[PDB]
Amino acid sequence: FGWFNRMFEKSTHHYTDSVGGILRSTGRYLVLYLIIVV
Amino acid sequence: AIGLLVDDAIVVVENVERVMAEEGLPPKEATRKSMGQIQGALVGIAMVLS
Amino acid sequence: DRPIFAWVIAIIIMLAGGLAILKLPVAQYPTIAPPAVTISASYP
Amino acid sequence: DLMDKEGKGLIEATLDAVRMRLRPILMTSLAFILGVMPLVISTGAGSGAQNAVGTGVMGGMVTATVLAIFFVPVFFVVVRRRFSRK
Amino acid sequence: LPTGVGYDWTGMSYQERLSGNQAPSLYAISLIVVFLCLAALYESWSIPFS
Known about the structure:
This is part of a larger assembly, with five copies of chain A.
Chain A: H1 2-12, H2 14-24, H3 27-37
PDB class: membrane protein
Keywords: membrane protein, 12 transmembranes
Entry title: Structural Basis of Multidrug Transport by the AcrB Multidrug Efflux Pump
């Protein structure tokens, strides 16, 4: 199926590639966490 | 509860499905060493829902 | 043996125990004498 | 279980962790949302209490996975709490 | 009001409500024990806060 081929494309690139991108930063997403509590 | 019931049943089942591909192994020892990692959480999550 | 696990057992007793002091009688001597009912009429 | 038993991975153990379990987070949570589906609406006469229950969980599962598994903590936390000092 | 006129709250309501005084106390102890149970199976001062 192309259904399984889709799921592993998100899990490898896209998602997990942008997980390393957000982990590089820290000060911005901490200010976003405190904005959520407001 | 049904929501937080298949939740617990899904973690055990699909983690065996991981070991049957990541390191191809269908047997009983794949099911045993899969919940070497999972069992630690399974008792801890039971005490914090309580 | 390990600390953290044993210390969570002790902290349950820090609550549970002190909770009983805020949720159980502080009275004197308990009930001991055999309970007796008392009838009482009056012919003036 | 990766950090101590296997290798450290300063930020490549938290990254490597969801690299092999994004599936069960969105498999349980998507199966949860669909199980709560018939309470949110669908039925709306025999039991009006069904609307009160399932509305506050469908809301608290969209924002408990699409947020937790991403952007806002459950990743950022483990970095600045464990690491960064002691 | 004039002399010889007091009052008393009659008469279902209440003793201590639910979203009022009670809820703060229920959620309060809920955090205290959740932190302790994320330590018997973990051992740190960082895992519980996550």
